[model samples]
Target: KQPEPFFFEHGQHAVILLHAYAGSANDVRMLARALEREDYTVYGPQFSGHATDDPRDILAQTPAQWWQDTQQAISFMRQKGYTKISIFGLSLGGIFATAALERDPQLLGGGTFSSPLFAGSDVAEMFITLSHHQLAHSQFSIAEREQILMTLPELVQRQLQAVNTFTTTEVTSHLSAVTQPFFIGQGGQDELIDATVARQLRDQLPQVPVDFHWYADAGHVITVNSAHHQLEQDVLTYLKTI
Candidate 1:
């Protein structure tokens, strides 16, 4: 319960789900609960203290801090005797998960879910939308989203700048190093995360055990939109086998 992580213990493996930037533990909890209904021990950490509407705060911290925070959360869980771990991340969370695996592959065995892992066209659109929506400076006109921005510190702001370094090509190259089994789902209609880029991840990370599922009607945030709960079914079924 450090800050806002909602923990649920179930089955043999301890599963941790993380949300995207400006998102909270509860954001990923939507998927966590779906997994829990099927009996998976689930945990979600409240990184950045929930959703914020301001794009300014969104760009405040570098991406490394997000990775660092998640690493801290993982290490904390390991100390608690949860030896086996699996992670599920969306959008920015997806990027952080990759960094986490790079830092310590032993803690992560498999990963799943959506990412606008963009470059070129997708990257351009996503950034433009982010800027237009002011995602880095403002949120989607929600109270919860606004409050999340208010909690940010200048250091967190500094950390947010690191996100720009990992270009789309870099993410693809990094995927080559990932060896664990993976179950990745992409939304065809995602505006923020390029659907083409998401699909390309399968082709890019050929070295890693990757399973790709493309949803026809989904947007960038597949879990919360369209066939929302279907993500739960797909991920749960995959997790059971691997």
Candidate 2:
């Protein structure tokens, strides 16, 4: 089964919530509920080629199309009669949010969660882990899972290339042009990204009011991890100011 997108039409203000690279809208559901309860509408848009239980499905699409999905998210919110809108993402989703904020000047403000915007070391088997997790939770049979895992390594490398090119070329070029307030959240135990990235962003963008936050005990997926409460509250507090 495909990982479907989600939306909560609760409040006047709208937020475009995004998930990780190989993840689905489910990644941001908990955080969406947290914001929805506070009178803010949240929409978790799934990436173009993601959560299909096959890593090749993810590599089938590029970051360019993913950016289109981000635009569609904003358009969907606009169609719903929302004027005040912000965007946020988890991991690769965060990269899109940051890009949207930079290029789409009409947006109020936005941020990222455990995004490796500044710099980070690769965890060689990162996508393998993500792929295995996806297959384990999917409706695929054990035999099918094994088949996919066998072809995963090359697919993972291709996806990583997509990520690196988008971040280094598209994302970095627009970083210096950011004017709106940006929020950044990181977890200490994030294996995929270094916690020091928050400081790097803050240091580089001193002119921008960066809402820098840190979780001492949280993992990469802080939205649903042990430090989720703090992450949600911090996001809510940041929303209040926006």
Candidate 3:
């Protein structure tokens, strides 16, 4: 089965929401709801190979492919007559959001939550291994555990290749091209991504107006944690400023 992407209609101002790597559009539902409340139309695209029972599905597409998918989503909005547009994402979603800024300078602003610049360690290997070990012996049923273990190797290989491409080819080069206002949020307690990336983003995008937020107690997906309220407020505030 395929993931059904979500769209919320409101006023003319549009915002595209993106989820983390291997995540479904459901990952950004809360943020989308909040943006809709503020009267901004929102579109969250489910990238190829995501929101399914099998990890191999998500592993099929590389990060560049995902970015291209987002570009299409943005194009869709323009075709629909949305003049004011912005983007926000979590983790891998954030990386694509920043890349979107590079592609569309007309973007009003962008936001990133817990996104990394350089891969200090193999993120795909760590994610696959950690999630596998954590869930294998957990309280899930036998079928569920088997389903997860069934797709591990391919998920590791393909996702690792995709993430490495982003780390080596896209990250730094895209930062130099972003000319619009943006925000970067990092979690000090995030074990998956090194916190120092926030500084690198700030340092590299010297021409772009960037706002930085640090959450000392949060983890990788801060949008669903205690920091979410602050995130929502900050995002709304940034959108208004644009």
Candidate 4:
């Protein structure tokens, strides 16, 4: 089933929340609702090829489409009467959010959760693993799952190629372009991205005040992990600084 995009309208401060790759607005719903409870108008938009039944459907389109989707989300916010908008996204979403800061420096501020700006095969494998994990939770039966699994290896190579290309080309020199107060959230137990990346990103962003938070009990999916409350609290606090 396709996950519905969400907009909780309530107050003056508007935030755009983008979900992880292979996921949808559903992943960030809890955070969006939390922000809205504090009178924040939150918009969570799903990427162009996500939340569908088959993971391969994700690769049918490129990150270029996701970039367009990101721009559209920003435009949507502006058309809705939100001029002072801050953008934040998870994983792939975060990469695009930061990319927006380069082109749309007028944004109030921005950040990401578990977003790997620089890395190679690890990042690709991260996406691959998550895609597999997403598949595991699907409604597909064993027979159907096995069929896809056999075909998924070659598809996984294609995904890895896509991820490697994306990380190497699209994400380089990203932080230097960000002109807003940036925040980052990393999980202590993140098995996808290396633990060193948080510090690496913190050190690389010499242009802004970086608010870095480390969640001890959290994993790659920090938004819905055991430390989700802390993530919400830290996010709320970060918004205040912006």
Candidate 5:
């Protein structure tokens, strides 16, 4: 089983990690291993919307709930004596990551992978995800999707509605206001999303420094792909710079 509210005992400063959509905390286990290898405390919180096949239920939850869970996670670190913290999320987690940073500007850095940047894609992916069944065994496993759907029904509905109805302007406008150091990771072969969206997000955040990365061979799950080793190296390198 993956850890929920996983905690690593690194001194004062730690990196807080959040998994992508339809993901479990285990998704970032390798990354956590790497971070712990470097003696950095890592917190990967397994929220309500993960490790299941059905997203039909979880979507009802509001955006604020996700942020609240993240805020609680961040507060967990602070209570543990960690002063320096970096927020990292993937896909939907990225949206929350940006929001969390905006909510807390003092974080060291923020990182996202396969993040849905445009509001159009954001709303489309959710409902489309309901019918689009990925293989249970494969990376985009549909069975896994169903598992999540059943548990978080409201969140599931909200996810689809968010994708189908949300506007691109909202994505741009909301993220444009963020002023923290932003890092984005994209996969060129990602069939799940249009890679161009990364640059679109970059363009919107005109004032912030963005460390944009593209993995030529990696798809949506960049951290679990063949290029993951390179990803780890690059992320660690970035962490050292922070």
Candidate 6:
């Protein structure tokens, strides 16, 4: 079964949460609920081909389509009378959120949790292999894993190519264009993106006001892991500032 998008309406200030690759709105569902409790409206949008039983569906779409999905969610908020808007994203969602900042300067402020602005020479190639063997295995059930394993190599290559479409130069350019206060949060133990990404962003966006947070023991998707409770509190604190 496919997971549906999650939305909670309350308060005037709104936030749009974007889920990570190969995941559903559930990726950020807990965060959304926390924001709602703080009187902030939240919308967690599923990316193209996500929230479905088959991982191949996610591999079929380009990164551009996933980005467009985030923009559309922004547009949806605009139509609903949300004057003060903010965005928060996880992993792939975070990359697109940073990209969105360039296009939408009116955004009050936004944050990325475990997002990457530039990939090292080995990142993509490593991700291609890890994504298929580890990420897919961890995220899918035994039956679903068996299904994905059927044509695993082909699917891995397709996903790798799609991700490569978003280059470092493009992301860096977007970072240079952001004018509002932004937050960069990282997990010290993130298995995928190294903590060096946070340092790189600091160097790239020297002129931009940014609040940085580091969780020493947390891993990827910090909002859903052992540090989740602290993450929720930190997110709430950040939202209060915007």
Q: Which candidate's TM-score is highest?
A: 2
Query: Candidate 3, residues 1-242: lDDT per residue as tens digits?
Result: 44578989889889998888767787788878888899999998988777655455666677778878888899889998898999988888888888788877799888788887666544666658755755565667888888877788676776766676776587557678887888988887887878888778888888978888888888777788777778788888888888
For model 4, how does the per-residue alpha-carbon lDDT over 26-103 read when each residue is reduced to its tens digit?
889999878988999999998877878777788777877888998999999989998989999887788888888867
Error of 6 at 137 (Å): 12
Q: Write the per-residue lDDT of candidate 5 for residues 115-171, one digit (tens) a residue.
A: 876633333454445434432333545566566545544555556456434323333
Whole-model Cα lDDT of every candidate shown, in order: 0.65, 0.84, 0.79, 0.82, 0.70, 0.77
Please provide, for model 1 over 135-240, each residue's C-alpha lDDT reduced to its tens digit, 9 standing for 90 to 100: 4445255665545445444435343335656534344457777767777888777666557776676676777777678887887677788757778788877777
| Segments in model 1 whose C-alpha atoms lie over 4 Å from true places | 1-3, 49-57, 121-161, 167-172
Candidate closer to the true structure by lDDT (higher is better), 4 or 5: 4
Q: Which one wins by TM-score: 2 or 6? A: 2
RMSD of 4: 2.6
Colliding residue pairs in candidate 4? none
Candidate 5: what lDDT? 0.70
Q: Who wins the lDDT comparison?
A: 2
Please provide, for model 6 over 85-189, each residue's C-alpha lDDT reduced to its tens digit, 9 standing for 90 to 100. 999888778888888887788998887888776664234444355446553546678787766666766666666556656736455666778877788878888
TM-score of each: 0.76, 0.91, 0.86, 0.88, 0.79, 0.86
Give candidate 3 regions above 4 Å deviation.
1-3, 129-158
Native-referenced Cα lDDT, model 3: 0.79
Worst 10 residues of 6 by lDDT: 121-130
Number of backbone collisions per candidate: 25, 0, 2, 0, 41, 0
Candidate 4 lDDT: 0.82
Flag the better candidate by TM-score, 1 or 4: 4
